[PDB]
Amino acid sequence: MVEFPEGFVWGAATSGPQTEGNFHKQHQNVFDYWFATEPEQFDAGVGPDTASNFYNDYDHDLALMAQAGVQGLRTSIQWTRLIDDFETASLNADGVAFYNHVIDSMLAHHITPYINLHHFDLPVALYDKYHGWESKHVVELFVKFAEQCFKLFGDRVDHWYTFNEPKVVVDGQYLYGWHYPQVINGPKAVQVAYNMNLASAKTVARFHELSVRPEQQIGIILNLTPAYAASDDPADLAAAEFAELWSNNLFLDPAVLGHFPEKLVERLTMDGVLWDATPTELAIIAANPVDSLGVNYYHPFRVQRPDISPKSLQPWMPDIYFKEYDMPGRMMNVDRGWEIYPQAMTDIARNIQKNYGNIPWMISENGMGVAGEERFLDKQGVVQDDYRIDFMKEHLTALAKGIAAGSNCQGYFVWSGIDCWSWNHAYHNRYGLIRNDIHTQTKTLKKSAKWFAELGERNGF
Amino acid sequence: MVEFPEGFVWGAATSGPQTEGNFHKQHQNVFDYWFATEPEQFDAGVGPDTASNFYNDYDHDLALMAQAGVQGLRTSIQWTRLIDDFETASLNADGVAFYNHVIDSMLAHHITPYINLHHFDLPVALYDKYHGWESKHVVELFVKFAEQCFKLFGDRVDHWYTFNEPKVVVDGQYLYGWHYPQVINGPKAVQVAYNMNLASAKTVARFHELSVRPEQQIGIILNLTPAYAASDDPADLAAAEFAELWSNNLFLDPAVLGHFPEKLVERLTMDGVLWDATPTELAIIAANPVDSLGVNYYHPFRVQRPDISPKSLQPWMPDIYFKEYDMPGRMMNVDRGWEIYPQAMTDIARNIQKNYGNIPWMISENGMGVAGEERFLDKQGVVQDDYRIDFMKEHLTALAKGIAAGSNCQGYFVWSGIDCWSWNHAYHNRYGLIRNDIHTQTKTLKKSAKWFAELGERNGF
Numbered sequence: 058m059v060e061f062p063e064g065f066v067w068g069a070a071t072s073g074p075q076t077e078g079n080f081h082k083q084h085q086n087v088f089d090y091w092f093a094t095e096p097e098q099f100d101a102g103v104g105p106d107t108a109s110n111f112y113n114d115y116d117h118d119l120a121l122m123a124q125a126g127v128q129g130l131r132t133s134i135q136w137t138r139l140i141d142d143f144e145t146a147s148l149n150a151d152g153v154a155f156y157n158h159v160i161d162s163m164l165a166h167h168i169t170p171y172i173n174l175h176h177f178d179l180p181v182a183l184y185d186k187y188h189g190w191e192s193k194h195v196v197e198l199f200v201k202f203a204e205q206c207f208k209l210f211g212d213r214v215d216h217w218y219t220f221n222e223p224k225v226v227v228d229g230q231y232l233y234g235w236h237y238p239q240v241i242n243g244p245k246a247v248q249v250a251y252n253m254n255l256a257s258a259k260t261v262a263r264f265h266e267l268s269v270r271p272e273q274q275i276g277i278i279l280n281l282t283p284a285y286a287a288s289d290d291p292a293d294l295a296a297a298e299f300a301e302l303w304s305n306n307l308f309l310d311p312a313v314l315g316h317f318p319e320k321l322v323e324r325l326t327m328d329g330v331l332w333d334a335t336p337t338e339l340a341i342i343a344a345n346p347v348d349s350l351g352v353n354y355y356h357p358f359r360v361q362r363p364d365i366s367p368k369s370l371q372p373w374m375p376d377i378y379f380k381e382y383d384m385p386g387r388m389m390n391v392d393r394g395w396e397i398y399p400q401a402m403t404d405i406a407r408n409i410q411k412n413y414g415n416i417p418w419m420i421s422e423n424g425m426g427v428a429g430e431e432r433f434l435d436k437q438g439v440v441q442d443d444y445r446i447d448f449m450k451e452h453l454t455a456l457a458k459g460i461a462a463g464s465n466c467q468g469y470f471v472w473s474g475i476d477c478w479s480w481n482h483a484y485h486n487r488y489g490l491i492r493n494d495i496h497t498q499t500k501t502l503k504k505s506a507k508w509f510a511e512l513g514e515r516n517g518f
Numbered sequence: 519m520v521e522f523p524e525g526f527v528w529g530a531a532t533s534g535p536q537t538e539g540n541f542h543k544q545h546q547n548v549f550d551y552w553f554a555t556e557p558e559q560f561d562a563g564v565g566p567d568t569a570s571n572f573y574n575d576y577d578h579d580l581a582l583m584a585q586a587g588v589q590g591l592r593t594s595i596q597w598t599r600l601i602d603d604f605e606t607a608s609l610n611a612d613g614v615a616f617y618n619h620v621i622d623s624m625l626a627h628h629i630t631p632y633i634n635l636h637h638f639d640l641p642v643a644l645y646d647k648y649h650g651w652e653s654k655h656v657v658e659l660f661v662k663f664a665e666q667c668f669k670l671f672g673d674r675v676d677h678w679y680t681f682n683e684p685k686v687v688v689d690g691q692y693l694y695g696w697h698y699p700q701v702i703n704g705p706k707a708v709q710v711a712y713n714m715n716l717a718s719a720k721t722v723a724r725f726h727e728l729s730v731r732p733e734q735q736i737g738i739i740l741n742l743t744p745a746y747a748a749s750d751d752p753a754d755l756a757a758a759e760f761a762e763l764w765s766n767n768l769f770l771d772p773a774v775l776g777h778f779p780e781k782l783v784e785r786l787t788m789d790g791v792l793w794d795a796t797p798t799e800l801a802i803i804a805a806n807p808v809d810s811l812g813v814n815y816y817h818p819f820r821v822q823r824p825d826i827s828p829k830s831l832q833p834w835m836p837d838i839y840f841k842e843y844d845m846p847g848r849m850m851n852v853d854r855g856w857e858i859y860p861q862a863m864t865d866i867a868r869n870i871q872k873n874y875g876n877i878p879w880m881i882s883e884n885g886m887g888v889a890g891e892e893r894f895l896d897k898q899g900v901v902q903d904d905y906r907i908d909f910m911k912e913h914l915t916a917l918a919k920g921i922a923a924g925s926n927c928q929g930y931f932v933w934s935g936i937d938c939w940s941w942n943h944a945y946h947n948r949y950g951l952i953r954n955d956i957h958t959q960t961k962t963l964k965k966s967a968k969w970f971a972e973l974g975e976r977n978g979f
Contacts, residue, residue: 144605259798262798336723344801
């Protein structure tokens with residue numbers, strides 16, 4: 058009844074930091090270092106050191122995911138595992154061998170690889186030495202790392218992504234304390250958002266210098282949730298318009314249209330917090346847009362006016378212009394604190410189709426996190442996650458409406474394949490099609506896995 | 519009788535490596551290492567370690583150049599003196615203090631500073647670690663170096679040069695054995711010529727990122743001597759055609775026009791030796807042409823067909839397309855092996871005028887070196903170098919005719935002010951207006967010096 062285009066990709070999304078574990082990894086990223094020194098900041102004291110044991114059990118993990126109808130797996134290559142010397146991007150041989158093993162195994166199981174280069178995992182040594190993403194030198198080191206990935210694996214990987222949601226890096230490392238180093242500095246955050254936008258452009262440039270097949274393409278993964286104003290009142294609208302420019306246009310516009318949003322640049326210039334740019338850097342951004350777009354969506358985004366005037370003496374933050382708003386009568390994922398609003402996927406699809414040239418895009422992430430899933434085991438040891446199937450049904454329904462209106466969506470990737478380590482939340486919330494009992498790292502298909510495999514076979518539901 | 523436009527600069531030219539000595543210099547450049555290691559390759563075993571003692575005697579040295587009518591002085595800052603760590607361009611405080619002292623002493627003596635950034639003096643450690651100018655990483659490290667010079671001295675230096683004749687670095691380091699490392703390898707030479715053009719464009723961009731006054735301008739110093747064919751047999755003008763593209767257009771076209779000469783790139787392509795270039799690098803070159811041109815001219819350049827076919831089985835060199843030619847009846851500087859042909863300066867002036875938008879340019883070097891000037895000491899120990907005064911009048915006569923056709927020549931710099939250290943030839947040939955007795959480091963003005971001072975006070979002769 059709900060059907061999908063011929064050739065639609067049914068996939069799963071994870072990342073290296075949340076699956077592999079730190080086995081034999083040469084370098085600490087910022088989350089590795091944070092757990093090593095502040096294990097109390099992580100749920101039940103569970104860090105990334107073992108995660109879901111993908112380093113050791115990748116071949117059987119891929120077999121399980123293949124059973125669950127995963128036609129494409131998007132994951133990430135860790136900068137801190139592939140590279141020995143960050144300055145020259147020399148290679149760690151065992152890191153190279155591991156990713157060769159993973160990729161060949163995907164292929165042996167008929168899973169198309171989607172390879173993203175960075176998922177929140179900056180080497181902590183680059184933060185100590187250069188302050189990380191604030192440094193344009195670090196931006197160059199990143200490009201060197203990307204070059205190695207393309208040279209080593211571009212023979213059998215077609216689909217690439219530069220970053221998974223750079224905004225979460227900006228937000229987490231420099232605004233709200235989610236990511237080590239937990240800097241709280243608005244103006245620095247502005248410069249970091251610029252630098253990652255520039256690092257992405259330079260990575261598309263290097264990618265196409267080395268591309269040999271016409272199938273090879275590289276994208277970026279962004280969150281494009283609309284900023285819904287609380288009311289039609291003018292102050293709520295003004296808060297919405299800025300929240301939109303800041304949370305969406307800051308990255309979508311450079312990546313797809315090749316320039317930063319004029320109104321946002323004007324605003325940050327007025328507040329004296331604009332980034333430092335050179336003409337050459339702006340020319341690189343303008344000359345190397347992405348080939349495709351990955352959209353991550355989980356919950357809506359609503360915004361009302363700020364409590365106090367933005368002109369009050371206070372540290373600059375993007376939040377001086379908008380405040381989060383809770384809508385009465387919202388439909389809630391109560392244990393999780395997330396509103397359920399599948400219509401936003403249709404809003405997203407329409408925007409891409411209308412204002413961004415209907416660039417090729419996919420749902421790179423959509424999923425539901427539930428705690429204590431052992432409450433839903435049946436008498437055969439399988440999690441009856443009907444709530445997860447329902448969640449997928451409602452959101453896929455909204456997505457198909459966007460497609461029927463003509464949006465260029467080409468796939469849907471579940472977060473996630475196998476339950477994986479969710480940063481400070483660790484394993485408190487489960488998202489997978491496949492459960493992981495993490496004391497023994499024993500993995501077992503959930504009920505939704507069989508439904509997902511069957512969805513891919515009928516290409517609908 | 520022969521007068522010049524108002525404001526014409528009468529100056530002198532040298533370099534850091536050829537004047538300073540290595541007193542308390544932190545790093546070895548390629549020539550320092552070559553001398554410390556093969557002193558037998560240098561005339562009379564005289565190296566750059568003391569040179570003309572400019573490190574110790576800059577103040578009185580400058581007072582004497584001013585007496586000789588040096589209105590502006592061009593010289594160079596040594597990468598190997600100013601920089602502590604090359605990777606970051608951190609500063610050597612004593613080097614910074616030295617160059618501040620030199621620049622401030624120039625202005626106290628009313629000499630305008632013309633500061634060039636590079637004169638054959640690659641740090642030898644950058645060769646050992648990266649192969650020097652073959653590495654685009656080294657190209658970035660030079661821009662870091664150039665940025666520090668701009669920030670440290672741009673407050674009282676208006677006129678800058680990226681390089682003094684990069685073709686001599688290509689030729690000497692990678693084709694004919696003139697410069698340590700003495701590599702003989704055509705393909706590498708092609709890539710080094712391209713990399714250095716790229717460093718200069720990147721330096722021009724950085725300079726205008728930081729320039730605050732409109733007087734501040736940055737140029738490049740090239741040799742633009744025309745390639746005169748031996749005859750008008752088609753084989754000789756084919757040789758003169760390539761010799762022109764290779765020796766002049768290879769650097770002048772990128773520097774001034776923003777692009778490499780297409781028929782050169784076509785032949786480098788057909789022969790399988792083209793440099794590796796990215797679109798971003800080419801756009802940088804197109805977008806940052808130099809502000810002005812420095813021309814070095816000493817002697818003409820004559821070319822005939824090669825002895826064998828360019829299709830013979832031999833390693834690729836540019837010389838497979840042309841062989842130098844000795845014209846019967848040439849006017850010669852016999853003691854030196856150099857033809858005298860002042861008309862060439864008139865040809866250069868016209869070329870720049872007609873084919874390069876008449877860009878502001880100057881003669882950055884012109885001079886005559888003779889050996890054993892002890893033979894022309896008068897009773898008060900003054901060199902009576904009438905041969906030097908004559909040489910200047912003939913070339914100035916030719917330059918003045920070029921200006922009268924309207925060519926935008928704005929100054930004339932003689933090589934050199936004080937006798938300086940001429941690489942492997944050391945002090946065998948002297949070019950200065952001021953003699954240096956190198957055993958005692960005592961400088962006395964030659965007769966040409968007082969003649970130069972009258973020429974500036976009058977703008978003619």
